[PDB]
From Swiss-Prot, chain A:
Present with 19800 molecules/cell in log phase SD medium. One of its GO terms (molecular function) is metallopeptidase activity. N-acetylated by NAT1. The lineage of its organism: Eukaryota, Fungi, Dikarya, Ascomycota, Saccharomycotina. Belongs to the peptidase M67A family. Gene3D superfamilies: Cytidine Deaminase, domain 2 (3.40.140.10). It comes from Saccharomyces cerevisiae (strain ATCC 204508 / S288c) (Baker's yeast). The keyword Phosphoprotein applies. The gene is RPN8. It holds the Pfam family MitMem_reg. Residues 4-138 form the MPN domain. This is 26S proteasome regulatory subunit RPN8.
Curated annotation (Swiss-Prot), chain B:
Acts as a regulatory subunit of the 26S proteasome which is involved in the ATP-dependent degradation of ubiquitinated proteins. Necessary for activation of the CDC28 kinase. The chain holds residues 184 to 272 of 274 of the full protein. Belongs to the proteasome subunit S14 family. The lineage of its organism: Eukaryota, Fungi, Dikarya, Ascomycota, Saccharomycotina. This is 26S proteasome regulatory subunit RPN12. Present with 9890 molecules/cell in log phase SD medium.
Curated annotation (Swiss-Prot), chain C:
The lineage of its organism: Eukaryota, Fungi, Dikarya, Ascomycota, Saccharomycotina. Belongs to the proteasome subunit S11 family. One of its GO terms (molecular function) is structural molecule activity. Acts as a regulatory subunit of the 26S proteasome which is involved in the ATP-dependent degradation of ubiquitinated proteins. The gene is RPN9. One of its GO terms (biological process) is proteasome-mediated ubiquitin-dependent protein catabolic process. It comes from Saccharomyces cerevisiae (strain ATCC 204508 / S288c) (Baker's yeast). Keywords: Proteasome. Residues 1-158 form the PCI domain. This is 26S proteasome regulatory subunit RPN9. Present with 12400 molecules/cell in log phase SD medium. GO terms for cellular component: cytosol; nucleus; proteasome complex; proteasome regulatory particle, lid subcomplex; proteasome storage granule.
Amino acid sequence: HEKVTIAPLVLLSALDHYERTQTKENKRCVGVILGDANSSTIRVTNSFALPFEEDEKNSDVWFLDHNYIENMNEMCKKINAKEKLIGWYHSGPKLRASDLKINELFKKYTQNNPLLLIVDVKQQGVGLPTDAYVAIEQEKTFLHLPCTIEAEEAEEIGVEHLLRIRLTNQLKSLKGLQSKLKDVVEYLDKVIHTILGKLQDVFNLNNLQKALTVKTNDELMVIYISNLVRSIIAFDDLIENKIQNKKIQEQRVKD
Amino acid sequence: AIRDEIAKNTELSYDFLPLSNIKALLFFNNEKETEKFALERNWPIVNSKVYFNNQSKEKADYEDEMMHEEDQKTNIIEKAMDYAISIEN
Amino acid sequence: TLEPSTSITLAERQQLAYDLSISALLGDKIYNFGELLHHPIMETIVNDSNYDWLFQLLNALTVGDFDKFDSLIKVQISKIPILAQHESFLRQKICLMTLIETVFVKNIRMLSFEDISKATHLPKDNVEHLVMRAISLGLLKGSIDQVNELVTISWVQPRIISGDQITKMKDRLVEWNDQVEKLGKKMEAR
């Protein structure tokens, strides 16, 4: 399949247009990603906003200027020639009816399958403040591609200069069953099987490990054998340092 | 007290023993009285034989996270690994 | 899903349901006739004149009675013995999907020769051959143990049923939550 690679330059750029424009919950900042969608690895090296206006009274009313779309994409070619139109990004926590009608706009100048991106300034719950989706039809069918972040050498190192485990893993793992339980109950009363079929595939696949439980305990003992030997090595240094500490005390008594 | 001490040995040392031998080993004068002692000791009785299902032990006052626990077995194994980390820290 | 297109009257719906029904007689793949009931078909067609095969074969895969369906049909489809063979697969596949997690509580996968013989209404000799032919068609996987009387079948064919997995999914939620208060708070309060 394909994967979406979002550079930290793009994630931080979309967060800037939200605060500078004083965008409230009634508006969502829309922008255009730039990159190469030809290969299986989709990387976005550039992002910019657009004068978008949102209307909550009518989902079919949106203000977008196509002149600024083609001009800015042409003027930014002088920087890097690898930047083309692979899709667009927009703000807001949720996908409303106005987002479905604006999907067919950029598809005229886009060759391959466009890429959609949702930027969340609040980042409420779990991970992934920016979720990526693909727009394709047979009815609109959206698929969530794996979201990864990879930058250049100077870009990844520059983040560390500006900033100069097990418990968290168990908390998010427990919340996965709580969030899935609410999705099944709400969908049960919504119908009164296709959506629940995909969740049943993952949920079904000492229950099945009973055959490997005997062989698992034998491997855990071998792991402790290495840990027991390394523990003795650390214990020898404690006695060696205790004798070494006395040599310093013996010099303090004579001198 | 001697016969009660022998009864502790007859559980592990005898898997199956008939009724006539228990009377002779512990010096009993009655066969019906022999089965009466087996009821207080919780000894299963079948025809011409006496088994012991009590070899497995449990209870014994109160114990938690010690001496072959039940539901904490998975955690204590991981807890023992986390105790050595804090000693070094 | 087509709302706007494929204009059809009640005459062609019965002709369309004919090819949809017969496809599932010998079809051993993708659930069973109940999928045709999930779509607005049976409610739009007549309930008799050999259009009721969906209702008769629905419970025939549970109770396992072949005299109810064979008595109401003609000699056209009853001459081919293959039709009676495929009805034995879908009857057992309902119980074989219960081996890991659907209904059963302890969620332990084990099957003997005696328990499966009473559910499929077949002897111990015919049930061993029925499982081998089911895996050979690509519907199932796994192995078979005749020494200890154990049947291990890998989960392949999905199902559209639901509502029985909510309670058993809570078992993983409650049992793992106890370690958050005990083991989880032990490492945090270190």
